[model samples]
Every structure is written in structure tokens, then in C-alpha cells.
Target: VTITVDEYSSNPTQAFTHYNINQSRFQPPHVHMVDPIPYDTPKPAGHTRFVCISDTHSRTDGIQMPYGDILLHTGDFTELGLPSEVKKFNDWLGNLPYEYKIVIAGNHELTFDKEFMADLVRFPSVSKLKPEDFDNVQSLLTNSIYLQDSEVTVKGFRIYGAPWTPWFNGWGFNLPRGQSLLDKWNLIPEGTDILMTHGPPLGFRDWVPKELQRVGCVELLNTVQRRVRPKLHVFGGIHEGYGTMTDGYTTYINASTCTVSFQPTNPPIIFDLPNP
Candidate 1:
């Protein structure tokens, strides 16, 4: 489908239109204005197929996966990042046939972020558990290269992943809105091919329809649109906002597997990038 500025200027998928959002403060940084590959679209020749999904919340048991060169899981593998739960999640990864599986932690992965566990006593939900239990939790992901504010090169693609999201209900990897999150975004390389984040950048599938508001990071949006301009940005923290949006230069996918109902019913989003 052709995307026209006049059409999306009033649409919810792109940056503009929301009455509460101020465009002057943070405008869309785009050049190409191209249409993003729709979900389940066929891959073209001389390209790499990437299967994107996020916010599974440890419900991978019944979900079917399509074949692709790489599997990008934007995380939330467990309900609470328990050793047992983490192992189960990793077991599913082990069963996958994809040669390269990349993952990043999400807010639901409570124990994955040591900083969140430092003051665990206050939250009754996780107060009973000792923080030491997850000291080696990351190591459990034996089948994948788990990224945390880091980058890796696979099949000539410079991919980066970060676990941070705006402070939400005191979840793991939550950071303040401004410089705190900006610092994390700065870690992403300028020419990254694939960027994975647990949360979306502002105005790109970040709308919470019920709340009638946007819940994305402004700093991260600036970093992604103004600076890095990665070819593809895959994320999912807001289950209600599972879809794809693009700003000419980049295609953003809130490839959340679970819906607001918490069921893993959303299909995995697939996109193809020309092989380097």
C-alpha cells in the first residue's frame, strides 16, 4: 500500500496526528517514506529473512515459528526471570532450527537486570527471592547470543540490542526519561543494520489506545531518528501496540507476540533485508 503524508498525517501509525503529541518538539526524521514489508510477506532473492517477535512472556509452547535465516527475540522470556522459567525459555530456543537467534531482555525479565534486583526488598512480588539465584541467568541462553546494550556482526549485519525501557511500574531495565535513556541509546552504533529494543521509540506504534497517550521514550526516538537511523528497529513492550510503522529511512516493528489480554496470539513479523 502506498503511504502518503496527507493520509498518515491523520493516522495513528505514524508520528503526527495525536492531539496530545507536539510535533514541533520532536518531528519525524525521514527521507525515503517507503512502505515497510507487511507481516508474513515473502522474502525476495539475495535477502536475509528475519523473524521478529517480542514480549512472549514465557508462552512459547504453542506458538508456531516460520523458517528464516535469523530469529530475533526482543525478550520477556519469563514471567519473572526465574531460573526454572529461564531454562524453559532457553529450551525452546534450543529447539529452534534457525542458525542465529538473538535475544535481549525486557522489563518482565526482573532478575536479568542486576540493578533492579539491588533494591528488591521493597517490591513484595519478588522480595522472597534472593538476587544471587540469577547471577548466571544469562548463561542459560546457550542457544542464542543475548545482547544487552551491545552489538554483534552476523552474516555481515551490524546488529545491536538494548534492554532498557522508560520507567514503568518499576520493571527491570527501567530508566528515567531523559539523559539516562539517552545514554543507553548512545551506545547503539550509527550504522546499525538491525536494532532491537524492548520498548518502542516515540510515536512509532507506541500509542496506548485506551490511555489516549504515547508511552515511548523521547530520547530514544531522537537517538533512533536523528542519529543512528538504523535500517530496522524491532521492539515490543506495549502489547497493545503490536504492528509495523516506518519513517522513510527505517522500518519499526513492535513485534509483540502477546496481546493486551496476555495471550501469545500475535503472529511473528517477518522482513527481508538485502544480503550484504
Candidate 2:
């Protein structure tokens, strides 16, 4: 069985409203608006399939990667972004048979963001590394396009990726939850077809049961709602809330391949993105 969990529609204009009327401590409600452009309705010569997964934590060995025109990994490929861990991940990406693979570093990718790791606890195993240790991550992962607050085009679709998430444990790519975070989100260009971030927006598959709180970025929510309203918003930082949610505008996917406890058992999430 090709265990692909498909949970979206090809027609972007179609309305799929989700009502979380009774919001609780763990289940925050989504405030949706009617999409104006209907960007998702564009149909091109053929459909471009997208396969997404994240938070592998150095466990891609067990993942049953699905075939698609584009493979997107939202990050956390390593437990600690050790040299060996990153090497193993790069090797795996090198072998993956995908036309275009896009990747963004998660908070766990400590070494990739040297500035963030400067003050954190560096075990002897990872302490000896210099800034150049991760210099070749993009080039080494030859098959993948590594993005950090960047954008790329594949099959004529504009995809923007940002790796920053709300600061947690002083990990990499973290910003303060207020204006600082909003500044980062403001960098997203307008009219992006696909928006990839390491963390989800508030109230859309961002609930953390342990803290009984919704840990997604509120600034991101405002940006996505008020400005850069892409057709698809893919992310994976909160492990417990892994699924798909559409607010009649953009489809929110928390494609965490691992379980809440970091086990790689969840099936890959697949969806078709029609080109214009």
C-alpha cells in the first residue's frame, strides 16, 4: 500500500470552511476570510504533486517517501544537527529521486545557524565545529534546494520558505514573539503560491497538549490573513498537531512525519498543486 494521506482539493476556489466555534484551552478556533483571488483554481497543462514531511530527527531511514514533482521538508531533519546527523541527512537527500527538493532548517538544526548556537550548550561532540561546518549544506544536498527566508520557482509555481520559529530553548531560527517576529514575517513576498515555514500559524494545527497552549506564531497568522495569503501554507514544528486544515483560503498542513514523541511512523502527506 502506498500510504499517502491526501486531504486537500485541486480546485483552489472551492470553499472548505472549518468552524472551531467552541474554542478550548487546547483547541483554538480559526478565523477565516473568503479568499479574493481564488489563486488555487488555476489549471495548467498538468498537475504538480507536492510531497511534504518534517521533524524526521535523523530518522529518514524508515520513511516511505512518496513520489512527487516537488518534495518539501520543513526541517528538524536531525535531533541535534550534529555533523554526522547532517551528513547522514545530506546523503539521504542526495539519493532521493525527486525532480526538485526544497528544504529549510528547523530549530533543531543548531549548527546550521551559527549565531543562534553560539550561546547554547554545546556538548563536546558538537563543540569543535566552526561556522564553516555547515557552509556546504546547500551544495552538498545537491538534489535539494535549501531555503532560509528565500523563494524559488518550480514548474512555474512560486514557493517561499522561511525557517524561523518562535524562540524555544534558544534553538536556531527563533525570534521574539512580538514585533521582531512580525518583522521576519513581513519579508514574505506577495503572491507566493506556496509558503513553507518551520512553524505553523496560530490556531491552525498548532496546539500543544503538554502546555495546553497553542504555540503557533500570531504574527504569522496576521501576515497570512492580512497579507501574504498563499494558496498553501506548509509547516511542521508542533508534533502533536499533525494533520491538515483549510480556512476557506489557505490550506494549513502540519506535515510532521514523526509522532509527538519523535517516532517516524506517520505517513507522508501528499497533495496536488495545479500550475497556472
Best by TM-score: 1
Candidate 1 Cα deviation (angstroms), residue 254: 0.6
Report clash pairs, candidate 2: none
How well does candidate 1 match the true structure in TM-score terms? 0.86
Q: Looking at model 2, which ten-residue stretch has the lowest summed lDDT?
A: 6-15
Model 2 C-alpha lDDT versus the unseen true structure? 0.75
Q: What TM-score, computed on C-alpha atoms, does each candidate reach?
A: 0.86, 0.82
Highest lDDT model number: 1
Model 2's TM-score against the true structure:
0.82
- Candidate 1's error at 141, in angstroms? 0.4
**Cα displacement (Å) at residue 154, model 2:** 1.0
